[model samples]
Target: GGCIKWNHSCQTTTLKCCGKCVVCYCHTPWGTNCRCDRTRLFCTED
Candidate 1:
């Protein structure tokens, strides 16, 4: 349930995929950049 944060009630986020790995982010002002391994941000997108 706490997989995401900020964007959608801290539950949903946009996805960013690459050859290395596919990841996501829920914080507002998101982008399609490479996943930052600094924080564990899970996400679900369309």
Candidate 2:
């Protein structure tokens, strides 16, 4: 997928979203999304 302007940390793969209705890929407990499967990353909208 594309890249987002939200943020990322070291050792973690940065997966971004180009959609306005969805903001995700956060798995640090306080994130809006995360990679829950082999190739499926989910996220929440801001």
Candidate 3:
């Protein structure tokens, strides 16, 4: 339904949003592990 963290590496980076900001972790060769800014909600992928 929402964003998810399929996989991630030890290294991570932060992203700025209109409302707040989010932390995106490098999972594989591509894509990002999306998370909530204030709530810090963790999502899962298939």
lDDT of each: 0.35, 0.42, 0.36
List of clashing residue pairs for candidate 2? 24-43, 25-33, 26-33
Q: Per-candidate TM vs. native?
A: 0.18, 0.21, 0.18
Q: Score residue 33 of candidate 2 by CA lDDT.
A: 43
Q: Report the number of backbone clashes for model 2.
A: 3
Off by over 4 Å in 1: 1-16, 28-46
lDDT against true structure, model 1: 0.35
Task: Give the alpha carbon lDDT tens digit for every residue of 1-46 in model 2.
Answer: 4554434322245554434443444556685445332222464433
Better of 2 and 3 by lDDT: 2
lDDT of 1 by residue, 1-46 (tens): 2233222231224433332233344344865432333334453333
10 residues in a row with least lDDT, candidate 2? 32-41
Summing lDDT over every window of 10 consecutive residues in candidate 3, give the lowest-scoring window.
1-10
Each candidate's number of clashing pairs is 0, 3, 2
Lowest lDDT sum, 10 consecutive residues, model 1, at 2-11
